[PDB]
Amino acid sequence: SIYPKFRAAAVQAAPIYLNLEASVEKSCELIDEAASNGAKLVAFPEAFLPGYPWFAFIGHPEYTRKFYHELYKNAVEIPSLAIRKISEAAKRNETYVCISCSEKDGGSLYLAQLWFNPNGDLIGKHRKMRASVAERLIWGDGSGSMMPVFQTEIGNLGGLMCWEHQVPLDLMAMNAQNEQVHVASWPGYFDDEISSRYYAIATQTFVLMTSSIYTEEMKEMICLTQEQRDYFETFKSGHTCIYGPDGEPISDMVPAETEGIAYAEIDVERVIDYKYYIDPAGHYSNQSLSMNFNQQPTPVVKKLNKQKNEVFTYEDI
Amino acid sequence: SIYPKFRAAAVQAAPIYLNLEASVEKSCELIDEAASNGAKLVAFPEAFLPGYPWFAFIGHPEYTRKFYHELYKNAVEIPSLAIRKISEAAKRNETYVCISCSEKDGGSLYLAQLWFNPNGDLIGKHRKMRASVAERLIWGDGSGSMMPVFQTEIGNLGGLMCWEHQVPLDLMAMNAQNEQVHVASWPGYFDDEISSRYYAIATQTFVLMTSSIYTEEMKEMICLTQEQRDYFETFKSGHTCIYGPDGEPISDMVPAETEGIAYAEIDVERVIDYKYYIDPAGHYSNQSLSMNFNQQPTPVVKKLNKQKNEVFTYEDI
Amino acid sequence: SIYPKFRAAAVQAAPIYLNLEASVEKSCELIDEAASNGAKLVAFPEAFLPGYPWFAFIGHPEYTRKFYHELYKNAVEIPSLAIRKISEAAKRNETYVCISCSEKDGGSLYLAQLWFNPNGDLIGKHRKMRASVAERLIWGDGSGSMMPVFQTEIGNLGGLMCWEHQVPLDLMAMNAQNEQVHVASWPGYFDDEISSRYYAIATQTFVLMTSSIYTEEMKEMICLTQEQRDYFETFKSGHTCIYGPDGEPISDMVPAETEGIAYAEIDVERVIDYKYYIDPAGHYSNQSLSMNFNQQPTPVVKKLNKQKNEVFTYEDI
Amino acid sequence: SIYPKFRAAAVQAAPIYLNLEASVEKSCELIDEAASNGAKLVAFPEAFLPGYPWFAFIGHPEYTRKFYHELYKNAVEIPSLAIRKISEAAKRNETYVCISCSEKDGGSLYLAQLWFNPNGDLIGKHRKMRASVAERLIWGDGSGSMMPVFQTEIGNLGGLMCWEHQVPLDLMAMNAQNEQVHVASWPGYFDDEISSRYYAIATQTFVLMTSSIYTEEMKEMICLTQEQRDYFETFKSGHTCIYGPDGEPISDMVPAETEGIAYAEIDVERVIDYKYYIDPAGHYSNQSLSMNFNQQPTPVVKKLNKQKNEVFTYEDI
Amino acid sequence: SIYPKFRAAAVQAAPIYLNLEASVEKSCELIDEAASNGAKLVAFPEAFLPGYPWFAFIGHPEYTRKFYHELYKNAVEIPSLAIRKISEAAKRNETYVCISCSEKDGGSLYLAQLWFNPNGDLIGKHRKMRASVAERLIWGDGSGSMMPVFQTEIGNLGGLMCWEHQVPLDLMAMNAQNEQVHVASWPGYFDDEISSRYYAIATQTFVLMTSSIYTEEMKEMICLTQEQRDYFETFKSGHTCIYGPDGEPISDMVPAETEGIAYAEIDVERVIDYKYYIDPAGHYSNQSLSMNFNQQPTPVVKKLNKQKNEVFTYEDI
Amino acid sequence: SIYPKFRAAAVQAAPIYLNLEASVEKSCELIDEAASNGAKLVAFPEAFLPGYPWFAFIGHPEYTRKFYHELYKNAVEIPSLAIRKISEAAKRNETYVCISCSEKDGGSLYLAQLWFNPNGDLIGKHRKMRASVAERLIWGDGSGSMMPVFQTEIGNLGGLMCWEHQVPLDLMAMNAQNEQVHVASWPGYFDDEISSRYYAIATQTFVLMTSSIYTEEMKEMICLTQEQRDYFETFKSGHTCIYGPDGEPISDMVPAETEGIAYAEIDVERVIDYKYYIDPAGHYSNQSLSMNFNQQPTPVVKKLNKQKNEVFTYEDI
């Protein structure tokens, strides 16, 4: 029950497309750059580590099958070198970090947000509940047991990705847990300055809207024909900004498609002035409408009492 | 998280019926033959070392009692000479070996697959979970603690025996462990082309399908009367082949009852193109259907704090 | 517990693409044709009534957004004239009917199999558990409450669609309810001879595999350019046949893409001989592996105690 | 805690082979025969209703496959007319009845003992925990949740079938529930005196040992050849007697293969004199040896929240 | 895994009552008798060496206190002359010997079975797990550390005393260790042919049943009053016989309660023919019922790091 | 950590021998008598409810057989009318009660101390750890999980029975739990004054010593002969008294073999003056000597997941 005051940073950038190793070091450089200015929280746009699958939108599924190979080879398993590097970066600069990636758990990929701690440990993970229009060909669905809210030294943190903001049930689920600071991860194509502002208004929290940008090498490796190139050249871009609990901006929007970072002074004490008006899960409720939030871990196959098997060594035999 | 390339061998042959030592030397010779051609994985047909109990299918239980004696005297206990011979064979040719036998563990027999490692150590064992129609008179059942998948230098290996392929729960248990190369041990009497191809399709794996053959010297001791002989003369044969992740053959099927070996170049990186379509334990899942894989060791009688007792020697007294 | 003998027909045909009104009358004529030869059970290939969304495979999502308009307009709602006419046809010929169609319930489309009694009543419905690679764009997912198996005058009927045969948990769910006759619905593109035969072997049932075909009028509207026409020309067709409990054909496979119907004589008494060997949900089970089948109805929003409100008419006011 | 005194009847008889309908009326008239002499508890030999499958012991499994058809057709599903008739008979004569039958649940057969109250209700069921030898071809296995002991007006009742008396863990499971009267169901082929006498001595209970007999009409159909006839003619018969808590007979044993009934005056007060000496699950125990008894129900597929579904009748459409 | 063939001797005799030094002479005199006939295994009755405490059954606890004096002073300390004389008797005749005695360890008496190798070394010991009825006033209890099964050159040997055969958990502990030849020590009073015969079939072992006899000189010291003399004259005598794995005697038992020895040709390989039928700890097991066997040594006071302390001799001081 | 002051009562009385119903009402009237004088804790002598088995000491086991019947029929099961009456008595007077009885659990009797709360609830139970010389024919042993010390409004309470005071490990186990008030249950025959005072001195507690008395009606049914009558006439009686933390009496001892109650004012503040001197489980300890207290529940058979099975009523069938 604390109301801290800190400095936040929302990073707008693009990775080295479908190259995990280079993206990790670029992310570490960005973390160091943002922390050097005094940020206590750093957020990254979306699917930042391997890269967002734009190929899934400009070709038929059999064409997407070619690049699914490269995306699969560059995924981020939870015990991995990429996570070790990002943990080192988070601890070195003593900042919370929220970086999203194409996690793989078994034989399938998922889109996850990995949360780190000034101590450098992975405090949680959030999987996307449903994939968007063409993301359904790439990532699987999540579960209700992976929508955490972390009580930390900088308030109750949380986040959502892309069109998770247009589903009122997720808004209610996050409001139930008393979120105070929100990280909104977006790609560049979709319209994001209306969902994030409304989320800030309705849930009464600061929102760090982060968006990605398009590089030339991405287009070179993605677009094969001229029709694909001229179709992909018409994709718009998303903006990066920080919003207050009332929905008005509190920072300076990153000016254009160029790389940049937006800083703001977040005073969690200010959300109280707006909890006075509307609280959807509190005083501003009706007994007729309710919600069920089942959050049991529900993997397809549950394994119990797994023990370690012995090996009869060559000397033993 | 590796996707190697290697050469696989699927051995088709028949043992010296109900004679352990002759079968063991034959197995070693076959392993050397397969290795001399460059194979990195050698798979053996079924119940190979003593021989498959065909007597149980062509006579009443009191007739099968006569041959249960000979089968029992030729069983393979885990510490034994046969296992050390196979270990030497595996280490000498630096190949993985998957050979099945009628394991003896205590008072009765079990059918097990033994997995050997290029260093010559028995990396694991797998017991059949349920004996087929007439095999219920010979072997006991296995457990869930003995369905391992080995993460090795040539991918994630595994296997099942005979009609374990027609139990969907075993398919789910194996798929939940992310298996990539599968060994399908079959005898000669059952139809095995549909089950193996479907398994390859539905688990996205390379399936080494191995089957045994009949010998006249076997019929000399198995069949006693002319009715038994003419009944056993109608048993169909089993084929040997290697299938790709899509179920289509990638090798040359062994032509006929003739003893032989089938070779293929297995590239584990080709399963990624098919995880894109279907993944039963991953993205292709529904929250309403689930599974419980309880894999605790469940022997009939657990012994704790096993101790070695003292002996008062004749000199001592 | 009855074991009837009856004649069944498997229909291979294609509709008037994306035209519900013509497709319904076409299906009625096909039902009359099948019933005039003595068939007591008529099955239909897949997504028959409006047609299968082939456009989703040969173009990027923005190209599919246009054809989604026409597909949505021609969808089937349960209280509609399509069901009216199909029920009339079923009662007229006193036969069971299994027709698949793109049902719509609310603002979203689903793919369902509709079952009609000889009296003409819609005895049940079954939504596809999860769409395949490219149909994720078009249809939503079903739930466990919609996997019925119907006890009828001709056995225990049931059915699945397309790749629901490659999900072992679906096989177990259907088997646990003691199915006897299975209707497999396929489109032409995918390989279906292995999945259906394996399903027949594993579940010990008669499988009526039905597959659609490509019309020349469909390519007129689906293919807009030459790079799409040449690609769509390479889509292979599917086969239609009826299989016995052992996976061996019991009818004459429809010879080619030409529209036709396959007839077979089904003797449900024959499944008992093959329940003697294997019963995955019965005696051929293990206690370490078990399945959970939660069949609670789970819509997103549950509406309770709804009533018919009153409206004050003009004369009243 | 009550120690009643009553009269018991142990029945020696054989059914009309594989003729469930006639066997049921035979068993009913036998219940009236036993009750008209004052018997308060009636027990039947084993697998009485359809008939014990002797065909599995005198031929190869491909020959048992034929008679499995007839056995399957005559199996007893719990909601059946056979149970209706047996309940009517039990209520009519106000006696406890213990009848064994080849129960069928789904697609598989099981061997069960059905217990009926004097009120006519089915108080419990007990499935055999493991089939013996050739029985494994016919029946599945039970579980731990189906080993009940019933507190009744005539003491604590219970029972086991055939070789369940040679498994010490079954003895311990029954002893831990404080059984007082035991019904031992036996076929005629095995040696039953020693096992039942030892069970009576070790568990300190009265044992009603019932055994079946061979009819000529059974051999006229089971033995197809002369070798099988001469082989089956050598099967020894089983005895029928009632034993005391000390293993000494307390009734005149049924003399020979002739059908008959054995009567005894059971006085459950007498077991106290022998609980004085030994009580394996009580004062005669050691802390180093222990037993684990898991009584959870373990069906292969668990179904939750089953709800009856609606059908849109013809008039509605 | 060896299956030898040898001759076994089951000795029936009575000791010189409560005279340890005189019974040890008789024991050796009887080992020579059996060995000179070709016996390779000699078994003796219960509490043979000092004598069995019959006084505990025919008088109140204060009358028994007088005779506990004589029994206590004739107990067998493990390092003692009684064991030295029996140790050299085994090596002199090169036979295995199993002799029961009233061991004393510390300040209390225990009932133990001592096993001697053909080389004369005490290979193991087995304490009774629980005294029977009146024996509770004389002997303490054993533990799980004292239930050994010896792998020898004549099979796997084991033993139990008196009512340890009626405790089903004791049967499972020995069966868990794969015993093949059993020695059943009984005194005269109890009924033994029923528990020992069942143990043969329930465990598939040859059983050497040895029993004691009543002497006239035993009744002189035991029976004081005439009321005791007539009561002690109604004690039924035991029997000595050897049973096969079938449960049927293989030797002509001793003619009566005189002194004699029974011989048999034990062939261990034929226990295989009965492991085919039933194996409680192996293939004939159900996962619901299991047992725990904690075989840690559990003395009341555990001592560690016992050392040697010096004595300062009169010369040193 | 409270140190209350209250009044305690130690009861000397005898029950109506082997008659539970009369003994219970006698106990209730004694509790009322004690409470009417202000007593806040009432303790009862030994095995009170059915009566102590004196027959075991004056006759051989076959004579004790007869009276074991009457003892068994009068045993106190935990859900019984005797416990209901005792709880009613305890709540009606609002006093703590400690009563010993021959509990039965299953087919075996146990000797237990039952503890009741001023609210009338059975707060705990304590089975005797080991039965005395002739009590071994009657009662079984307890375990380590049934040695509780209850933290109450009148201090920490506990108790032991008879020769459990001569076992130093019991003293240490009670000391480790910080007992403050102790109830020593004794029968008449043994010597009790020396052990109770030593327990008080060694554990620094107030000891309520209670003992029984021989009645004339008991000898009529116990002593069947004159040799038994004159022998039983020599048994010496016990003493009832209350001792301080130093073994010095703090109350007037009940004079002779007469029913009576001893009253004392107990001030638990006085144990502090004696924890100053010695505390065996505390500051007065040595690292060389240690004790293990394994207090897991160890019933012979453990039952898991017990559930209530359904019954099909007559109407349903």
Interface C–D counts its CB contacts (< 8 A) at 98
Query: Is E92 strand, coil or helix?
Result: helix
Alpha carbon distance B183, B149 (integer Å):
11
User: CB D122 to CB F309 under 8 A?
Assistant: no
**Nearest alpha-carbon partner for B122 in B157, B79, B161:** B79
Q: Do A311 and B273 touch (CB under 8 A)?
A: no
The residue count of chain C comes to: 317
DSSP three-state, residue F181: strand
Is C46 part of the annotated catalytic residue set?
yes
SS3 B101: strand
Helical pair B81-93 and B20-36, crossing angle rounded to 10 deg = 10
Q: Helices B168-175 and B193-203: crossing angle, nearest 10°? A: 40
Which subunits count as partners of chain A given 3+ CB pairs below 8 Å? Answer: B, C
Output the six-digit token pair for C297: 């109805």
Beta bridge partners of D126: D113
Closest in A57, A169, A300 to C61, CB measured: A57
Element holding E289 (H helix, E strand)? strand E289-294
F59:E60 CB<8 A: yes
Distance in Å, alpha carbon of C286 to nearest chain E alpha carbon: 9
Question: Which of the 8 DSSP states describes residue A309?
Answer: P
Q: List all residues of chain B from 261 to 290 with a beta carbon under 8 Å from chain A.
A: 272-273, 275-276, 279-283, 285, 287, 289-290
Q: How far apart are CA A35 and CA D118, in angstroms?
A: 83
Report how far residue F251's alpha carbon sits from residue F265's, in angstroms, rounded to the nearest whole number: 8
CA nearest neighbour of D168 among D142, D141, D131, D129: D129
Nearest CA to D112 out of D82, D86, D89, D146 is that of D146
Cβ neighbours of C288 in E, within 8 Å: 287
Which are the contacts of C313, defined by CB distance < 8 A and separation ≥ 6?
none
Does the CA dihedral A284-A286-A290-A295 come out positive or negative? positive
- The answer to whether position A44 is within a domain reads yes
* Options C21, C25, C46, C257, the catalytic residue: C46
Domain that holds residue A30: 5-276
In the sheet that holds F108-116, the strands lie side by side as: F122-127, F108-116, F96-105, F41-43, F5-12, F260-267
CB pair distance less than 8 Å for E286 and D247: no
What is the largest distance, in Å, between two alpha-carbon atoms of chain C? 76
Chain-chain contact of A60 with C59 (C-beta, under 8 angstroms): yes
Q: What's the rounded Cα separation, in Å, for the pair B173 and B281?
A: 9
Question: For B61-93, what is the HEC assignment?
Answer: HHHHHHHHHHHHHCCECCCCHHHHHHHHHHHHH
Q: Residues E206, E266: contact at Cβ < 8 Å?
A: yes
| Residue A167, both tokens | 């589903």
Cα–Cα nearest to E242, from E48, E42, E89, E52: E42
For F:104-163, CB contacts with D below 8 A are 104-109, 137, 139-141, 143
Edge-to-edge strand order for the sheet containing B289-294? A301-304, B289-294, C289-294, D301-304
- The SS3 call for residue B162 is helix
The resolution, in angstroms to one decimal, equals 3.2
- Do chains C and B touch, with touching meaning 3 or more CB–CB pairs less than 8 Å apart? yes
Q: Report the residue of chain B nearest A316, measured CA to CA.
A: B121
Q: What angle do CA D57, D61, D64 make, to 5 degrees?
A: 70
| Structure-block tokens of residue E34 | 């059996």
Cβ-Cβ contacts under 8 Å for B210 (sequence gap 6 or more)? B10, B11, B12, B43, B44, B45, B46, B183, B184, B185, B186, B240
- What is the number of H-type helices and E-type strands within chain D? 8, 13
Structure tokens at A96: 């919370």
CA distance D87 to chain F (A): 7
Q: Which token pair is E153?
A: 């050159």
Spatial strand order of the sheet with C181-186 comes to: C150-152, C155-161, C181-186, C206-211, C241-243
Q: Is residue E306 in some structural domain?
A: no
Is D58's CB within 8 Å of B57's CB?
A: no
The E289-294 sheet, strands edge to edge? B301-304, E289-294, D289-294, F301-304
Which positions of F are catalytic?
A: 46
Q: Is residue E233 included in any domain, yes or no? A: yes
Between CA C120 and CA C126 the distance in angstroms is 17
In a domain, E76, yes or no: yes
In the 3-class helix/strand/coil scheme, how is chain C assigned residue by residue?
A: CCCCEEEEEEEECCCCCCCHHHHHHHHHHHHHHHHCCCCCEEECCCCCCCCCCHHHCCCCHHHHHHHHHHHHHCCECCCCHHHHHHHHHHHHHCCEEEEEEEEECCCCEEEEEEEECCCCCEEEEEECCCCCCCHHHCCCCCCHHHCCCEEECCEEEEEEEHHHHHCHHHHHHHHHCCCCEEEEEECCCCCCHHHHHHHHHHHCCEEEEEECCCCHHHHHHHCCCHHHHHHHCCCCCCCCEEECCCCCECCCCCCCCCCEEEEEEEEHHHHHHHHCCCCCCCCCCCCCEEEEEECCCCCCCCCCCCCCCCCCCCCCC
Q: Which residues are registered as beta bridge partners of A161? A: A185
| Closest by Cα among F82, F97, F102 to F31 | F97
Strand partners, E6: E266
Answer for the pair E200, E247: CB distance below 8 angstroms, yes or no.
yes
Helix/strand/coil percent split, chain A, to 5: 30, 25, 50
Q: Measured between CA atoms, how close is B32 to chain E, in angstroms?
A: 30
Q: How far is C279 from chain B (nearest CA, A)?
A: 9
Does the beta carbon of B179 lie under 8 angstroms from any beta carbon of chain C? no
Asked whether the beta carbons of C160 and B163 are under 8 A apart, the reply is no
For residue D37, the distance in angstroms to the closest alpha carbon of chain E comes to 33
Contacts of B72 in chain E (CB under 8 A): 272, 275
CB C83 within 8 A of CB C50: no
User: Measured between beta carbons, which residues in chain F are less than 8 angstroms from residue E231?
Assistant: 60
The residue type found at E119 is N
Q: How far is A286 from D204, CA to CA, in rounded Å?
A: 66
| Contact check, Cβ <8 Å, D300/C119 | no
Best CA proximity match to A182, nearest among A213, A149, A211, A153: A149
Spatial separation of the C-alpha atoms in residues A176 and A169, rounded to whole Å: 11
User: Which one of A143, A300, A305 has the shortest CB-CB distance to B281?
Assistant: A300
The residues near C209 (Cβ < 8 Å, ≥ 6 apart) are C10, C184, C186, C192, C193, C196, C239, C240, C241, C242, C243
Q: Please, are residues C291 and B292 in contact by the beta-carbon 8 Å criterion?
A: yes
Residues C45, C50, C52: CA angle, nearest 5 degrees: 55
For residue C101, CA distances in Å to C9, C46, C98, D144, E201 come to 19, 7, 10, 46, 65
Residue A315 belongs to a domain: no
Distance (Å, whole) CA F98 – CA F152: 13
If DSSP codes are grouped into helix, strand and coil, which group holds residue A239?
coil
User: Quick check: helix, strand or coil at residue D127?
Assistant: strand
E positions 51-90 inside 8 Å of D (CB):
none
Residue type, F265: E
Tokens of B67: 């041959």
b/e sequence C233-250, b meaning 16+ C-beta within 10 Å: eeeeebbbbbbbbbbeeb
Which residues neighbour D58 within 8 Å (Cβ) at sequence distance 6 or greater? Answer: B60, D222, D223, D228, D231, D232
Q: Answer whether A300 sits within 8 Å of B293, measured CB to CB.
A: no
- Amino acid letter for position D128: K
- Per the structure, the count of domains in chain F is 1
Could you tell me which residues come within 8 angstroms of residue B199 by beta carbon, excluding any fewer than 6 positions away?
A: B165, B171, B182, B184, B205, B207
- The answer to whether the CB atoms of F317 and D122 lie below 8 A apart is yes
**How far apart are the C-alpha atoms of A264 and C229, rounded to whole Å?**
54
Contact assignment for F134 to E137 by CB distance below 8 Å: yes
Cα separation of F182 and F205, whole Å?
6
Could you tell me if D144 and E288 are in contact, meaning their C-beta atoms sit under 8 angstroms apart?
yes
What's the CA angle centered on E99, arms E30 and E141, to 5 degrees?
155
Closest partner CB to D290 (pick from E163, E288, E291): E291
φ, ψ of residue C293 in degrees (nearest 5): -125, 85
CATH number of the domain where residue A235 is located: 3.60.110.10
Beta carbons of C46 and C52 less than 8 angstroms apart:
yes
Catalytic entry in A25, A29, A46, A233: A46
Residue F302: count other Cβ atoms within 10 Å of its Cβ.
Answer: 14
Name the minimum distance, in Å, from the CA of E79 to any CA of chain B.
Answer: 7
Q: Per the CB < 8 Å rule, is E288 touching C287?
A: yes
